[PDB]
Structures are given as C-alpha cells and as structure tokens.
Amino acid sequence: QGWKQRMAAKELARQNMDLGFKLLKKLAFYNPGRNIFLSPLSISTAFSMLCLGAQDSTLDEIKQGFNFRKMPEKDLHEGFHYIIHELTQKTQDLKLSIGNTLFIDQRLQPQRKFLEDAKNFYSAETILTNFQNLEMAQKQINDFISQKTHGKINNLIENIDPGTVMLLANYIFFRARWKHEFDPNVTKEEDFFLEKNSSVKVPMMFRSGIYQVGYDDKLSCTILEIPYQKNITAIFILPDEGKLKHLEKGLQVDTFSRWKTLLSRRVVDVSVPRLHMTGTFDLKKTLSYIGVSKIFEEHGDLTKIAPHRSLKVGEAVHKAELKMDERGTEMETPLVVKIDKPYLLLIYSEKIPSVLFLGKIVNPIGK
Amino acid sequence: VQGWKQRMAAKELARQNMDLGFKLLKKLAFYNPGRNIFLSPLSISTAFSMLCLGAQDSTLDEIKQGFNFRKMPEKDLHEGFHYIIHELTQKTQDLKLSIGNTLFIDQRLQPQRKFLEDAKNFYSAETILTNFQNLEMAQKQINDFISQKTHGKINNLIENIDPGTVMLLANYIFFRARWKHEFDPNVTKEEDFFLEKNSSVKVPMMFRSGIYQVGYDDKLSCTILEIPYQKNITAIFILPDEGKLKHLEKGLQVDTFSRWKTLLSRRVVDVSVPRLHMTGTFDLKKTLSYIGVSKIFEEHGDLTKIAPHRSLKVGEAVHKAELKMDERGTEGAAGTGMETPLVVKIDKPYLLLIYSEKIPSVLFLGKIVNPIGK
C-alpha cells in the first residue's frame, strides 16, 4: 500500500519546510541585497544519503540539524526514496530531476554496502576521482555533471581546497507548465524596482483570472497562488514597502499554516516577472548556519563510506535551477497584484507537501 | 536541380575522406601504440575546408593539397560539405548527430563579414570573440560554450592555450543513435575482453540473436560484422583474429573494405558486442603534420580574409569525437512481441566504423584496444 513510505515522505517533507525557512533567514542575513534561491528538499536528500555512512557524533549532528531524529533510519531512507522517485519526472508538464553525486578519491576503498544503499535509496552515484591531481579531478567532476545534466550544469566546481579527497554535488532542476498558460504576446518588458528609486526593465508576464489571494496584516505582505498543472503551486509573497526584512524574520511554518487561512478564490489581475534562476551554495558555509559541521571535519565517523578514520566531506556544493515562463496547459471586481518589487517565491508540491524551492528574488534578471 | 550537383560533390568529398581517415588512423596508431584511437576524419575535413573560405596563397594551397580538395572547384567544395553537414545534422529520437566548428578569435581583431557569413551558411560554424589576454578565462569561455552547445556531450574541449594565441579552432562531433533492433539490457552481462593472449578484463557485453551481415576474411584473418542503425547508418566491426590487428592496420584501405563486402551474407548470428562511451581528443597541429599541413598554424600573410592582422595564425586546433554505444534501439521487430546461429563475440581488439549510407561517408573511425580503457 506504500502507506508507511508515503507517511515518512509527508513527515520528512513537513519537517523540511522548517529547515528551508531557517536557511533562508541566515542566507539573507549574510548575503543582503542578493538573490537567494535554493531547494531545501534537495539539500536534505544529500545529507540523509550521507547518514548511510556516518556514525557517532557526525551522524547525530546531521540528524539534529535536519531534524531526522524523530523517525527510524529505515524509514528515513525509505521516505526519501519515495520523495525522489515521485518527483523525478521527465514529462511535458513537469521536468524535475534531483541529483546526488559523491566523488571519492580512487585510492580509497568505498564500502559496497554504502555504494549500493546510496544508489538504491537515493539514486546517488559514487564516482572514483583522482584527487591526487586536482586539475584532473576538477575536470572529471565537471565533465560528469555536465553529462548527467545534459549541459545544464557546467563548471560545477571551480576550486578544490587542498587536501580534498571527497566532494559532494547536489543539484536539482525544475520546469513545469502552468494550469492556465500566460499569453506570450501580453508579456511586456516592465520595470522591476530594486529600490524605492532604482529600476530595471525585466520581462513581466500578465494574466487575469481566478486565484486564491489575500493579505496578511501581521507581516504586511500579500500572498498569491499561481498553480501549476502537475499538482504544484507557486506561492508569491509580495511584502509591502520596507517590510521585506520583517517578513524574513517572521517567516515560520506557523506562518505557512496561517497564510492558508487568509486565502480566497478571487479574480486578480496578476503581473509576474519571468525567472531563470540558478543558485550555487557552498554547503560547508551554508550548513554552518544550522549547526552542521562535523560531516566536513575529521572525526573517524565516515568509515562506513571508505575504511579510513581521516575521511571527511572536503567540499559540498548545492545547485538549484528553475525556469518560470508563460508555458502552461491553457465575475467580480478584478483585484490588482503586480510583483514589481523584491518578493519571496515558494514552489510547493501538494501531493506529499514539500517545499521544492525557496527564493528571495531581489532582481529577476540579476545573476 | 534536385541538388544533384551538391550531392555529387558530397559523395566525391566523402569518398576521398575515407582515404584520409585510413591514413590518419595508421599514423595516430603508430605514434600512440597500445591506446584506443577514436576520431571522425570527416569532421576534421569540414573544419579545414571551412578555413579555405578565409585562407589564401600557400596556406590555402597546402590545405587543398593535403586534404585533396584540389580536384574540384571551391564553389563545389563548400556546397558539397554544406550538403554533408545538412544531411547528417539531426536531433531526432533515433539519431542525434551534430558536427561543430567554432573559431574563437581575440576581441582586438575584426573578423570580416564575408568570411563570417560563408562559414555560417556553408558550415554552420560560429566565430566567437574571446579575450586571450586572460588565458584562464578564455579556456573556460570556450569549454562552457562547447558544453552548452552539445548539451554536455563535448566537455573540457580545451586544456591548454599557448601564450600569444589570437585564434583557436574547435572541431567536435558527437553521436547517439538507435539500433534497428534494440538489445535487451537484462541479458547484458560482464564478459571477458582479451586485451592480449591470456590477458582479460571484464567489460559490459551486450548480446542479441538475429539476422546480421557477417563474414570472414581468411587472408587478413578477421571477422566482419554489420549491426545496422535505424537512420541509414551502419556499425562495421572488423574483429582480427588474436594478434592479427597489427598486420591489418598496416595496409588498411577502402579497397580492403570493398573486398570484405564480397565476403558478407545475411545470417543468423549470436552477437556479443561491448558497450562503449568513446571519447577521442586530438591536437590537430600534430595530427595534420602527418599529412603535410602546417602553414595554417604558422605566420604568413594568408589569413587576412578572416581578420586583417599581419601576425594571424591558427594558434591552437583541437578535435574531439564522442560516441555512446548501448542497448537503445527500435522495439518490436524480432520473433514475437531460422537456421543454425553463428557466434561472433567482439572480445578482443577490434576496429569500429560508423558508416553513413546515403552519402557513403565514414562518420567515425575507431581502434578499440580496450572498450573500458582510455
């Protein structure tokens, strides 16, 4: 019946919503005035997969920071196997792929149990790499990712710290058709105001129709939902002028369960910018913001990966990519909501409630 | 009319190119013994025929001499290769084939429009401006372009750029195709591939039983198998008997293949073919030295039609061919969804030829000494 696997996925996806908001708060604090676009779910798959090979302090600190301690390990890996499988899709209405690749030096001896578990549960490959020549190792890695991602992720690695013998690559892609397509001709190049007096011309889409919309008088932010076809929803949170920081600080799962109350089906004249977002994150620095570091340190806890006490994830990279355009399947006083100022974006799956992406878009055409 | 003249030029160019390929394979295997040699002689020819659009005097004459372009007018040379590229270039489910020519020129130079338009119209070749004053950035700019254009099939094309380079040529070709009759991925076991006498290695070995054009040449002591693709292309496996590959290389010609075709016949065969993900990268400066072409990589006054500069020369030139051979193929056409089966196991060093049938052309030419090596 898949009942247990689907329950683990729902609990893991729910707990992951909390992680996403914690990372967004820290990433926006340490990187102000910059786009922050990531996939908390994708990041979680990578470090749940590493729990297949971690022990003692490293394993406990990973489960603590990601909140994996609430369920058994057997169900943790069975839940993520369900999540990845359901999501992993190459259809016309949804192009989604979650990639996890662990590069290990070829002189080390990866354990077969880990290798097979990582491939079966997470579809994660373990590639032998020549970390004795970092110039060669960097070329091996980038060539592998470029091939696997069909030229979408090229030059994934641009620097390898000296001493690296293991590197983790996490990458995700998303391309979905809206429930009601936007008119490509009504899409004009409008202004996106970076500040109260700083503008840039960006392609701005437009459509009028029924959307669940509201306003949160606590955070002073408007909430709009533009639905995708394949049971996914794009949630645009447009804060009022000067309340973006206030929104960032107060964002919580309690806020997520609360915004649902303020929604209602209404006719809205929506103006949404197009997006082709790519986010690259050093997972060593990012995870430090949530108290995970031992996995990137030598403690002798990764012997189940390769029999060596000095083993550690020397470098870890996350890459999130999303393309939002007009493609799609196809009453009262019209409302007006034009996203023409810094906003937050959440791509929320409805089956297996999961936050696929979490974005702070300060410039839809910046990079 | 009907494209007859263009299609005749293409056939004459493709035929002459078979001779070049066998000449290059012999020289590359001599200077690179015990290694896989996988290249596309046709792709290399498109690159240096395209440069004939902008070369003059000694450089132009030496290219036409070394590549044997002197036999037909230049108008027909470029119309023939334009036809070859057009027919081959496909991005369908049954065949993904693309031949790429990209000229990277330093941004201080001014590429001439006549050359740019002819190279784009006849050969689909792009001319991208690069900042060769920062060689690290130039190498990443180039490789990222190729990876993006080829969807990650041709990666890290360039690995080194000599200081002073102001022009760089990248020629690259990749290949994916569906067999006429797919192989069962489940029957694909890891069998032995004998690198030498009593020296074996485990390689993924595909298997299928069906009708194939097969034969055997008791003179050169080699087996000839043809596994056809769907879109009018054929994989030609020449399997020498143990220790007979070296003799075969010395003397391989089109005449040899024309004779082997006599020894073929449609027969039921239990074929065992290794899986392949071949990549070959070649410095075209050294490769073309084996056929007497060098001036294009030297400073003469012959490249002014490309860019007006007295010191202009092709500072670097790289060829990269990429191919993947796996089980993918058409479905539902064998048995239900005849005679004594023969047995052909490609389990020792062999030659591979990807042969186009409309415009008889050797798309790829490979010496596989180890299907999982290199």
Q: Give the closest residue to A169 by CA, choosing from A8, A14, A317.
A: A317
Judge contact between B162 and B96, C-beta under 8 A: no
CB B79 within 8 A of CB B2: no
Backbone dihedral angles phi then psi of residue B237, each to the nearest 5 degrees: -100, 120
The C-alpha of B316 sits at a distance from chain A's nearest C-alpha, in angstroms, of 20
Backbone angles phi, psi at B12, to 5 degrees: -70, -40
A185 in the same domain as A172: no
Q: Count of residues for chain B?
A: 374
The CATH number given to whatever domain includes residue B247 is 2.30.39.10
Residues in CB range of B346: below 8 A, 6 or more apart: B225, B237, B239, B271, B272, B273, B274
Number of domains present in the structure of chain A: 2
Kind plus residue range of the DSSP H or E element containing B364: strand B361-368
Phi/psi for B136 (5° steps) reads: -65, -45
Residues B159 and B125 reside in one and the same domain = yes
**Residue A314 token pair:** 């020397």
Asked if A22 and A286 touch (Cβ cutoff 8 Å), the reply is no
Show the beta-strand stretches assigned E in chain A: 36-38, 89-90, 94-105, 125-129, 166-176, 188-195, 198-216, 221-227, 232-239, 265-273, 275-282, 315-324, 335-338, 343-349, 354-361
Alpha carbons A224 and A261: distance in angstroms, whole number: 13
Rg (CA), chain A: 21
CA A129 → CA A109, A132, B159, B331, distances in Å?
Answer: 12, 9, 18, 37
Chain B residue at shortest CA distance from A143: B155
What's the per-residue H, E or C state across A55-80?
CHHHHHHHHHHHCCCCCCHHHHHHHH
* Chain A CB within 8 Å of residue B374 CB: no
On whether the CB atoms of residues B232 and B356 are closer than 8 A, the answer is yes
Least Cα distance to A356 among A107, A87, A131 occurs for A87
Q: Domain check: are B255 and B146 in the same one?
A: no
**Rounded distance, CA A138 to CA A159, Å?**
8
Q: At what angle do helices B74-88 and B4-31 cross, to 10 degrees?
A: 80
CA B130, CA B333: separation in Å to the nearest integer?
Answer: 51
Which of B140, B155, B159 has the CB atom closest to A146's CB atom? B155
DSSP conformation class of B244:
-
Residue A111 and residue A252 in one domain: no
The boundaries of the domain holding residue B249 are 180-274
- Rounded to whole angstroms, the Cα distance separating A182 from A186 reads 8
Q: B163 with B300, same domain?
A: yes
Which residue from B minimizes the CA distance to A147? B152
Three-state secondary-structure class, residue B105:
strand
Best of B147, B148, B154, B157 to disrupt the A interface (most A CBs within 10 Å) is B147
What does the DSSP assignment read for A125-170?
EEEEE-TTSHHHHHHHHHHHHHHHTTTSS-S--S---TT--EEEEE
Question: At which of A238, A273, A308 does a domain end?
Answer: A273
Q: Which residue(s) pair with A189 in the sheet?
A: A203
Residues in A 141-160 with any Cβ partner in B closer than 8 A:
142-143, 145-152, 154-155
Q: What would the DSSP string read from start to end of A13-27?
A: HHHHHHHHHHHHHHH
Q: Minimal Cα–Cα distance from A206 to chain B, Å?
A: 31
Strands A94-105 and A125-129: parallel
Which of B91-109 are b and which e, b meaning 16 or more Cβ less than 10 Å from the residue's Cβ?
eeebbbbbbbbbbbbbeeb
Size of interface A-B (CB pairs under 8 A): 34
Which residue of B lies nearest to A153 if distances are taken between CA atoms?
Answer: B152
Does A149 sit within 8 Å of B155, measured CB to CB?
Answer: no
- The span from the CA of B333 to the CA of B75, in Å, is 45
CA distance A299 to A301: 6
The token duo for B244 is: 């007979």
- Torsion, Cα B360 B363 B366 B372, to 10 degrees, reads -130
**Which residue of B lies nearest to A157 if distances are taken between CA atoms?**
B140
Calpha distance A254→A270 (Å, rounded): 26
Q: For B152, which residue in chain A has the nearest alpha carbon?
A: A151
Of A273, A297, A329, which marks where a domain is finished? A273
Which residues of chain A does B153 touch, with a Cβ-Cβ cutoff of 8 Å? 147, 151
Rounded Cα–Cα distance for residues B172 and B163 (Å): 23
Of A142, A143, A151, the CB nearest to B151: A151
Alpha-carbon Rg for chain B, nearest whole angstrom, is: 21
Q: Which helix (H) or strand (E) holds B353?
A: strand B350-356
Q: Give ∠ CA A195-A200-A206 in degrees, rounded to 5.
A: 100
Q: Are residues B191 and B340 in the same domain?
A: no
**Looking at the structure, do residues B199 and B169 belong to the same domain, yes or no?**
no
From residue B108, alpha-carbon distances to A62, B136, B168, B308 in Å are 53, 18, 14, 11
Same domain, B14 and B146: yes
Nearest to residue B18, comparing CAs of B371, B373, B372, B354? Answer: B354
Q: Is there a contact between A149 and B152 if contact means CB atoms under 8 Å apart?
A: yes
- Measured in whole angstroms, how far is the alpha carbon of residue B214 from the centre of its chain? 24
Are residues B199 and B63 part of one domain? Answer: no
* Residue B299 near residue B313 (C-beta atoms within 8 A): yes
Any idea what the CATH number is for the domain that residue A56 is in?
A: 3.30.497.10
> Which amino acid, one-letter code, is at A146?
S
* Most B CBs within 10 Å, among A142, A152, A154, to test the B interface: A154
d(CA B176, CA B98): 10
| Domain boundary residue, one of B246, B274, B302 | B274
Residues 6+ apart with CB under 8 A from B22: B252, B253, B254, B365
- Under DSSP, the state recorded for A296 is G
User: What distance in Å separates the CA atoms of residue A306 and residue A104, rounded to the nearest whole number?
Assistant: 9
Q: Residue B359 and residue B11: Cα distance in Å, rounded?
A: 5
- Residue A34's CB is within 10 A of a number of other CB atoms, namely 12
Does the beta-carbon distance from A142 to B156 stay under 8 Å? yes
- For residue B144, give the nearest of A139, A143, A155 by CB distance: A155
Helix, strand, or coil here: B339? coil
Q: Are B146 and B154 in contact (CB under 8 A)?
A: yes
User: What is the C-alpha separation between A11 and A8, in angstroms, rounded?
Assistant: 5
This PDB structure is determined at a resolution in Å of 2.3
Report d(CA B297, CA B307) in Å as an integer: 15
Distance CA A170, CA A47 (A): 10
Please, which residues have CB within 8 angstroms of residue B199's CB and are 6 or more apart in sequence?
Answer: none
Do A248 and A262 share a domain, yes or no? yes
Place of tokens 């001499």: B65
E-only strand ranges, A68-124? 89-90, 94-105
**Of A146, A149, A260, nearest in space to B143 by CA:** A146
What is the distance between the alpha carbons of residues A55 and A62, in angstroms, rounded to a whole number? 10
- Alpha-carbon torsion, ordered B41, B45, B47, B50, to 10 deg: -170
Q: Indicate the residue type of A17.
A: M
Same domain assignment for residues B166 and B297: yes
Residues contacting residue B154 through CB under 8 Å, at least 6 positions apart: B100, B146, B147, B172, B174, B320, B322
B22 and B167: one domain?
yes
Per the entry, the structure determination technique was X-ray
